[PDB]
Structures are given as C-alpha cells and as structure tokens.
Amino acid sequence: MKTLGEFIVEKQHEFSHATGELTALLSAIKLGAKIIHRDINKAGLQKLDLFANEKLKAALKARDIVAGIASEEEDEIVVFEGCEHAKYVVLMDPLDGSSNIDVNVSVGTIFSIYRRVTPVGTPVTEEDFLQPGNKQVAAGYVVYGSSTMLVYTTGCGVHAFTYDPSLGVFCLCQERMRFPEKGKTYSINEGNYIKFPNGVKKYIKFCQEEDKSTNRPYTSRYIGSLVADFHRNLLKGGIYLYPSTASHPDGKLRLLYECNPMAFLAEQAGGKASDGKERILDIIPETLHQRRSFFVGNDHMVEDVERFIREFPDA
Amino acid sequence: MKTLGEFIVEKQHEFSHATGELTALLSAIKLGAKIIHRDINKAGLQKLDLFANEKLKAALKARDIVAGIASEEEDEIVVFEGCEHAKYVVLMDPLDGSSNIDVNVSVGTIFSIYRRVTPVGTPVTEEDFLQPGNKQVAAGYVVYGSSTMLVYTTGCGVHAFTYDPSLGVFCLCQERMRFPEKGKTYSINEGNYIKFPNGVKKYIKFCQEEDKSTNRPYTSRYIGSLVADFHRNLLKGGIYLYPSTASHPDGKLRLLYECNPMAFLAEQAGGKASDGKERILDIIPETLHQRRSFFVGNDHMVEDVERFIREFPDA
Amino acid sequence: MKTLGEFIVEKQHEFSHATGELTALLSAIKLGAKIIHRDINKAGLQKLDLFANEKLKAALKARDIVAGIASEEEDEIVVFEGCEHAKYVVLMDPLDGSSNIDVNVSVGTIFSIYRRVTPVGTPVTEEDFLQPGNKQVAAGYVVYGSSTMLVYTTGCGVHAFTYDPSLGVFCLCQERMRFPEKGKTYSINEGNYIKFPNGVKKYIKFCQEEDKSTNRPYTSRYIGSLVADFHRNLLKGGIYLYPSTASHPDGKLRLLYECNPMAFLAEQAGGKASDGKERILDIIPETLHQRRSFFVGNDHMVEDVERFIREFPDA
Amino acid sequence: MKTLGEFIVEKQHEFSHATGELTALLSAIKLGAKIIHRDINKAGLQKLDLFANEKLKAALKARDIVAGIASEEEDEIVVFEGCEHAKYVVLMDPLDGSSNIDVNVSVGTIFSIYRRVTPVGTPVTEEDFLQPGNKQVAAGYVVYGSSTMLVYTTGCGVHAFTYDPSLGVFCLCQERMRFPEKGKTYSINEGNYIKFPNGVKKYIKFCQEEDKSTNRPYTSRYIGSLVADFHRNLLKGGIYLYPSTASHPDGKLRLLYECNPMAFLAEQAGGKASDGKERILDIIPETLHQRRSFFVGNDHMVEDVERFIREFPDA
Ligand SMILES: O=P(O)(O)OC[C@H]1O[C@](O)(CO)[C@@H](O)[C@@H]1O
Ligand SMILES: O=P(O)(O)OC[C@H]1O[C@](O)(CO)[C@@H](O)[C@@H]1O
Ligand SMILES: O=P(O)(O)OC[C@H]1O[C@](O)(CO)[C@@H](O)[C@@H]1O
Numbered sequence A, B, C, D: 001m002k003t004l005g006e007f008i009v010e011k012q013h014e015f016s017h018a019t020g021e022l023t024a025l026l027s028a029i030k031l032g033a034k035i036i037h038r039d040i041n042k043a044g045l046q047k048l049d050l051f052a053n054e055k056l057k058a059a060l061k062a063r064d065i066v067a068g069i070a071s072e073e074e075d076e077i078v079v080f081e082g083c084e085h086a087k088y089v090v091l092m093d094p095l096d097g098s099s100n101i102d103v104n105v106s107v108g109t110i111f112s113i114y115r116r117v118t119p120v121g122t123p124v125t126e127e128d129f130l131q132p133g134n135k136q137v138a139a140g141y142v143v144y145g146s147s148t149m150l151v152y153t154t155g156c157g158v159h160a161f162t163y164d165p166s167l168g169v170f171c172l173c174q175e176r177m178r179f180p181e182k183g184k185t186y187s188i189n190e191g192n193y194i195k196f197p198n199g200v201k202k203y204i205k206f207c208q209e210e211d212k213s214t215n216r217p218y219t220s221r222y223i224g225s226l227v228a229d230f231h232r233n234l235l236k237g238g239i240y241l242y243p244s245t246a247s248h249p250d251g252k253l254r255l256l257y258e259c260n261p262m263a264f265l266a267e268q269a270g271g272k273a274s275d276g277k278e279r280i281l282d283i284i285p286e287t288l289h290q291r292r293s294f295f296v297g298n299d300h301m302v303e304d305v306e307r308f309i310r311e312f313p314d315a
C-alpha cells in the first residue's frame, strides 16, 4: 500500500520538482475532502455548497501556501491576508452536482491550480485567475460516491487515490488512468433535446443507430454530476456533453472552475476536451464566471461531435 | 435519534403484529448491508455480486427465521437445512447495478419477503416463491451511495434509515416517504431508442416538448442502478422506465426479484408500478426468472406512459 | 465470523430458552455501548457518567422489554411507564472508572439482569432490585479500551465480543473465557495500605515474598477501572482487591451494581468472588446502595486472602 | 478545530524554523500511528511489536527525510539506503507496553528525533544515535487508549492531538500541557518491593503515610504501560518510577528509546526526569541498549525520591 503523500514524495519529477509545495496543496484539498465527506456521509442524519466552500477556503488558507482563491460560489476572488507571499492560486467548484446531495447520489469537488503571474508580496488579481487552461500546473477532483476518491494530475498522467475509512488515509489505487481504446457510452441531459445545437442532435441520433461494427447503439448514462459522469467515462470509456441550450446560450459549465481542470485531466488520460470547435485549454478567458459548451471524453467520440457540428452548423 | 430496531418495536401494528419476527428479518438484511458496504466502500483498495449473494444468504440462514431464499444470482431456490420450521421466504437481488461497482457509482440491494404457502416442517418449493407481488408482507432496498441507507415497507408507508458510521447503527431519517405531487424527471436508457415500443418513443418525445404549464421539457437522469434511480425519483418525483427492447423482448428486469418489491414500495409511497398495461403486483408469475417491462414512479407519469402505449400499440 | 446476535440465536439452551428476550436485552446494551463509545473515543475533541446513564436508560426503555432499572447514579429505582408488563429488571453501573475518562485510560459499563419478583402489570419495587446475586439471570460488562468489547454470561460460560468499527457490529472473539490455572498478578490500590485490614496487609506481603516455586513475588497491576482490571486478570490470571478502608468502612464497591455481576462472571469463568469471608452471590441485600469488600479472581488467590483474614482478624 | 499539520505550519518558530521537515517527520509518525491503531483496535477480531516496528520503519523511510533509525526491537541501527542525504535520525520504542495488547489495555509508541552528527552523503553511525538526551530536537509518543492521541515537543511546550475517526485526522486538543502544581499519585510495580533500592522503599512508605496536609497517603495507579502511566500523571499530576531490581540491575527502561524522550517531554511540561541522582537528559550514552533507573513526573515528587535515595543509600 502507498499513500498519497508517499506518492507525492516518490514522483519528484512532477510539479516542476517543487515537491514540498505540492504536498501542502493536496494536503489542504484532502483535508477539505475529509471534512466534506463527513457531512455528506451523514446527510440524512444551497447548504452543503456553502459548507464545502468555507471548509476548502479555510484549509487552503491554513497551509499558507496559496495567495488567493476563486470559487464558483463567490462573486469576487478571495485574497488571503497574510499570504501575499504565496505564489499559487486556486480556482474551485466546491461542490459539483448540487442536485444530487439530497438524493444520496454522487457529487464531487473540482480544483484547478495556477502559478500566479502578478509579483509576490503584492495581492493577487483577477489577472492571476483569468489565465488559459493550458497554464494550470495542477488539476483534479474529489468524488464522493460509494467510496471517496481523489484524482489529480500535474502534467504526467492521471493519478487516483481511494480514502480508506479503516485508516483515515488516501491510498493509491491507480497510478496511470487512461481512457480505454474506444467508448460506448454518451452522457448528456436528453431532456434538453429540442434546444440542442443541430449538430449535437445529429450526433445523438448517430449514437442511437444500429451498427454493431462500431458498438452502436451506445449506452446512455447520466448521473447529473459532472465529476461522477467524467470518472465513469474515463474508466469505462465514453463522452460527456453539455452544449448550449435555451437556458444556457454559452453552455452551463464554467470555463475556469469546471471545464479547464476536467480538460487538463481528460487530456492527460489520452482523451480530448472541446467546446465543439476549439480546444478548451487554449481559450482565453474573458470573465471570471464565463460559461462554455463542453464535450469531453474519448478522442474519437469528441471528434465525431466536432464533425457533426461542422456538417450541421447553426442549431 | 431513533434506531431501526427501536422503530420496529414502536410500530407494533405493522407486519401483522409479529414484531419479533420483523426484527430478526431486517437484522439479517442490515448485517448483510453492513458487510457489503464494507467491501464496496473499499473497492479501489461478476465478483461483488457473488460476495453480496453469499453474505446475504448466510445472514438470513443465521437468524433461523427464513425457510429458504430465491436469488437473482441462483438458478434454483435455496432451501435452508434445519429451517424447515421457518414460515417466511425471501427473494432478493443481492447487488443491483452491476455496471456501477468499478466506477464508484451507486448500487443497491433489493429484497422481497413472502409468507410461505407450503406446510411448515416440510421444505419450501417454487410454489412459495411464485406468488404474486400483492402477497408480499415486506419489501425494501439498500442503497450504497454517498451514504448507505435502508428503505422498506410492510404495507403502512415507506420508511428510510441512514447508516451512521460514527455509531455503527441505522437511524430513522424519514418515516413516511411519499412521491411529491408531480414529477419532472424521466429515467430510461435512451441509447436503446430505436428498439423501444412505439408508445414509449412517443412518451419520450412528450417529455421533451416545451410546455412550461406542465414543467416540460422534463429533466433526464439515469444512473444505471435501479435502486439509485428509484430512490431519487421517490424523493424528487420522476418515473423510471425499462421497456422491452431488442435484447430483452420481455423487458430486462426480473418480475420477482426487482419489479414486485419496488412496485410494493412505489405504491406504498403514493406512486404507481406498471408493465405498460397491467399492475405489476397482480401479475401471476410463471417462472422464477420471468422478466417484465417496468414503469414505476409518480402516478400521473406512469399513466401518461400507459396512455401512449394505448394510442400507439405495437412498437 | 459470528455476530453477537447470531450467537444469541445459536445458544438457545441459555437464558431459560427465552432467546427472543435475550436479544432485545443485549441489543439495548450494545446500542448504549456504541453511543457511549462514540463520545469516549472523541473525549479530547461527573459528565460522561450522566451521559452514559441517560443513554443506557433510554435504550433499555426503547426495547419495551425491561420493567425498570436501578442505577449507581440514581437515588431511587426507575420505573418505566408503559412497561408495567415487562418481566425483567436491570441494575447497572453506567460508567465504571470515573477517574479514567479524562486520561484516556480504560473505563467500562457493568450491568446485572434479574427476573422480577413482583406481579406483572403492576409497577416494580425495590423488592425486585434487592434480590441476592445468585438470582441474576444475566450479567456482563462493556470495556472501552484500545478496542471496545462486550462480555456477558447467563449461566453457561463467559462470552466475549469485540466491536468491529469497519462493520459497526460486535463479533465473537472468545466463546468460553476461563481464568488460567494460576494467577500471578494482584490488583489493589496500595496507597490505602495503612488502613487495610491486617489480613490483607499480610496477603500483600505474601504477594511480595520471593518464592519462585509459587511464582512469587507477583506482578502489580492497577488500572483504576474495575472492568479493565477484571478483564485482564480473567485473561491472564490474577486477583482484584478492594477491602474496607478509612474512607470506606464497608468497602467502596456497590454490592448490587458492581460486586454481584462481576461475581457471577468470575464464577462462570472458574474463578471466585468473596467479601473476605462469604460468597458475594449469597449475600442478602439490605439497601439499594449497600457497599461491600470485594475479592475476585483466581480461586487459589481469593482463598489465600480468605485464609490470611482468618489467621489475622481485626485490621 | 485545528489539525496537527495546520498547527505545525502555525508554529514556525519551533524546530529551528525548518517547518517543512517537521511536517514530513510527524507525517510519518501519524501514518504509522494510524496503521498500528487499526490493527490494535481489532486485536480480538511478540507479534504486534514486530508489526508496529516494520510499519514505523517503512513510513519513516518513505518520507525520504530520515537517514536511519534505531529501534528497541533491533540489535543494530538501520541505515536507509538512498537516504544518505537525510540529516535526521530517529530512535523509537515501536510498541511500549507489550504485556497490554492481549488484555485490551492501553499501549503506546515512543519516538525520539536527533539531528545527525556525521556528514551528510555518508551513512549514519551509532555515533549519531549515542547522543545525550539534551540534544534531541523532537520527542513524543502515541497512546492507543479509549481514543488514540499523539503528543510531542520540539522544545517549546508539550502539544497533544486526538485522532478523530469521523474525519481520519488528528486534531489539537491541548496546546500547552503542564503538570499540575502538585501530584498525588505514584506509579510503580510494587510487586518488586523487596528488591527495590532502600531509598525507594522509604519513599513508598512516605507515600502511604497519613498527612492530609500534603495529600498523603497518595493514590496508587499502575497501568503497566509507560506511555499510559506518563500521560495520566502529566494531566493529573503524579510520578512514575522504575528503579533497579533483581531482574534489572540498571533499571528496565532503555535510556535512549524510552527515558530520554519521555524526559524531554516531562521537562517541557514543567516536570522532572531523573535516574535517582542525575538528570536523565545529561547522561552520556555508552551503548545502544543501555538501561537506566527512571523517576519522572511532578518535580517535588521526583525530588522527594532523590532525597530518600540520598538519606538511605545502598538498597
Ligand atoms: O441539471 P442539468 O442541466 O443536467 O446540469 C447538470 C450539470 O450541472 C452540474 O451539476 C453543475 O455544473 C454538473 O455537475 C452537471 O453535469
Ligand atoms: O445497462 P442498462 O440496459 O441500462 O440496464 C440498467 C438496469 O439493469 C440493472 O443494472 C439490473 O437490473 C438495473 O439496476 C438498471 O436499472
Ligand atoms: O480510586 P480508588 O480508591 O482506587 O477506586 C478505584 C475503583 O473505583 C471505581 O472507579 C468505582 O467503583 C472502580 O472502577 C475502581 O476499581
């Protein structure tokens, strides 16, 4: 058995070799993950979003390693007083899958870590949080399901750890997660069908056609939690889609707090992350809460989606 | 706080007032639930189906309260040697949602309890397991999600309990679960679209139409675990569908191990359970592993499905 | 692995064959044990005595199996309203080893169960609680140490179970506990030396003499918790002593809440329990809070104590 | 609530301000503590000494922060291959209180940390482990009792943390532990009376005299585990004694693995640690497994012991 902290130490080559800092950063994350897990694993016994938000903020501030954070739950960025010396910033989706807490269905936490651009000693600015996904030095998520797992990458593969309640520690369970050769599952809220872009509706149809030669029709799975749907598709192969709709002209997901980190992860796993046309990681952010269409998963599936959008433009 | 065992004692009027027996029966179930939960909550650290199966069988035999069991994992019924005196039989789906174990997604256990028809002292026969759903004296499920819960009914409402890891006991969290007034979510594997009965495809379309007056289009949620999808729809309102397809001419779900218990539960919660035409609970079983189309959830939604099937017969 | 409840079922011959009742009784005890354990295992994170007291009382009342209880923490007996039909009474030392809670040292719970003498339907009276130890139908203790264990007897051996935090259940770990052939440890608060009866001081000296032929000098162990000292001496052999002193003319331990149950246990394990002269179990109680000198453990050691008291009377 | 790791960060002034290293060191310790706790909390469900030994060694090697270790269970010192660059060495008593594991009585782990004297890059030598107690830069213990706690010091007070099973993390419960103004408990194995040094026997007598003005006679407590007896005496006041006997001419405790660390702790808490004549921390070690008489606890009590030894020399 190998713990997360022991793995961090063992993989010196990652994170620009600043091993000491990576341990402090993830230590904050897992502590928050342990705390949130505790409240969630006893939910029965707009509320937990705030709790997760506060717990993660406080833990990150307590390691005196982060200069400030950006949260999907907050309007502005949060500058940690006394941490003007820190050189890292974190963006996070404290609790992804809000509609799943009360139903005892999987939810998760997403985090994205960037190295600040603004001078140390001084206070961080939106400038530090509006960097393109391709500049992240770290990203990952925590999934609170039948078991609680932490998954992350720094640019050298996707590593997964499982919390062992018997010990109270996270243990390595998979060192190099990779999408399988092909996918056969699509995850999308088909309820919003009529309002989907025409190219996406064509793709859906494609998925439902009978062609055993290509494993079609595909299987449909949609948990309602991006972290949970992503996790499954990475292990079993599949694609997750959330295009623009009536309610969300520019998609629903936040580009900075959700799209980029999951994109950095999908890619490090051999997958692909797109907004239907361009690479999510190369998009230049314009606002802190900018949303974006998201298509992530097996490369061939995302490509298919991209192709249908091409051949069938304008919803 | 009130435990499951203390609730059993307090609700003497239920289970034909044979309180002592109900406690032994559920004690077996929760023990199995605790054991399975342990292996599942540490899965990372066709396999668990067998483990759950053996654990539940052994626990039920150890209470010397059940005469024999029928399992979805077994070809024949299991007669408990030395229990020919027992007067109850149990049918069970040890682990529902096989495709979810490896992905850390919710799975569950389903159980159905009948009073034997064959004379005590003698060994139980399929006759005891081929009774119609409306004769069950008890039914329920265990859902292993962000938290582990046990849900059951004996004919007087649906009761839910949450496992408290801090104590190692199940506590009441909801004494009378009821479907809300209306539902706005449909759960079905849309991947199998083209092969669905024509009436179901029409219903799907119905669900996707824009009519704010009726909360349409509906939301789409499909976890892939019947227990998890059912649980959510009961708390939030919704319908779960699994019609006949190419792969499953008579639906996929087993009538005795899955349909009947969930049906007894849906009904006790104010919902409705149908195979598209008739009431699941009044169907006379023909074989031990008989499958059946299943439509369960809010009454108005099931009725809609029934109506479309009527107006659009033959797939 | 075998659980406590499964062991209860398997040993039908015990408890006058009223198996159903024994399960309800111990179920109350272990629930209280689980609850107390939870608060104790997080003490750091005259107070717990009250908490343990209330929790045990409530659990016993909730099984609707006990008519009333007598507690070392209470002045009077407690009559359970609505339980006038119950036919069992319980005496208990909710938290034995008060001076050990704050220091993270072992403490325990002791319980004694009698069948009532007064007519059912009517309310129990002190008469039901002032019966001699030899009439107990059940007795045992819970020890909260490095691990939490429940130990009990109904008159057919001493059975021990260990709480498995991984499962949240008590498992059999020893079905027939017996004192070893000989003991080599004495447990007494030697601080109260000068005030000990002369016969006891002689015995102490005896214990400290050099005579390898008899394993002397003996080892001295005194945890300060009767349950913890008893437990060790039963597994490893030894004697526990608490004679009369300046502060306690009639010993410190309560005859009904501490002496009798531990005596019933010592005896069932092949040991012996005395007040220095007579058998604890045959003493006729005079008051609810009557105290008594106590000498329990390996038979040969208790006999030695009895002999010195004889040869050296009057402190 | 504040975690151990967050406290480490907050107390930068300690450990020569090399905060990053202290976190890695204690991280190893607590991981070992979590692992051992797991096996101990399920002992029922010469053996654990070895298990604790291996687990602690491996954890320390995995942080790549220690150059080598000295264990009470090992004949020679252990040089960590690949860690010749490390600049810290650790001496440890993996499992203190061997005679307590099987009886579910408290046991603990003791550790002592020194900065190496030999050149980095090269392999550590006994020279690095034979330094006097006053050169330790860190010391502490883990006590596995009703709850599991970690206690340590670097020279600025004694800090205690309690493991929270609900979270799987150690939380601060006491930042500055100090012996109370006076003590009233003595901990010694009085079984070895006749062979004790004459001065110690006089002290024992002293402890048993009646003099309410000085809280005499004192209370006697002896758990059999040095870590557990020490812990209690520090919280409640008291003295722990283990003089030379027939079996142990130079006392039983090891000077390096037990005496020094506990001494560094006693002192940092306002107490005193002596071998009956000189200060334990200033003794120059001669051998790796050198034993020594030990008298630790409230300063006035140790002084009394020292005085009686003076006035009554030669056993
Ligand atoms: O309810 P909808 O429209 O399907 O949105 C679900 C999506 O929203 C989120 O809950 C929040 O971004 C995602 O986790 C999930 O994929
Ligand atoms: O993979 P499919 O065809 O969607 O089937 C999923 C269904 O099968 C089961 O896993 C087994 O009955 C159900 O729990 C679930 O609803
Ligand atoms: O503090 P003392 O006088 O040694 O008494 C300790 C005894 O008192 C109790 O704490 C209470 O009866 C026992 O558990 C223990 O054996």
Ligand SMILES: O=P(O)(O)OC[C@H]1O[C@](O)(CO)[C@@H](O)[C@@H]1O
Pocket (backbone or CB within 6 Å): C219, D096, D097, D098, D099, D189, D224, D225, D226, D227, D252, D253, D258
């Ligand atoms: O069995 P004895 O001689 O009292 O020795 C007990 C002492 O030995 C140890 O178990 C080992 O050093 C200590 O923890 C304890 O204080």
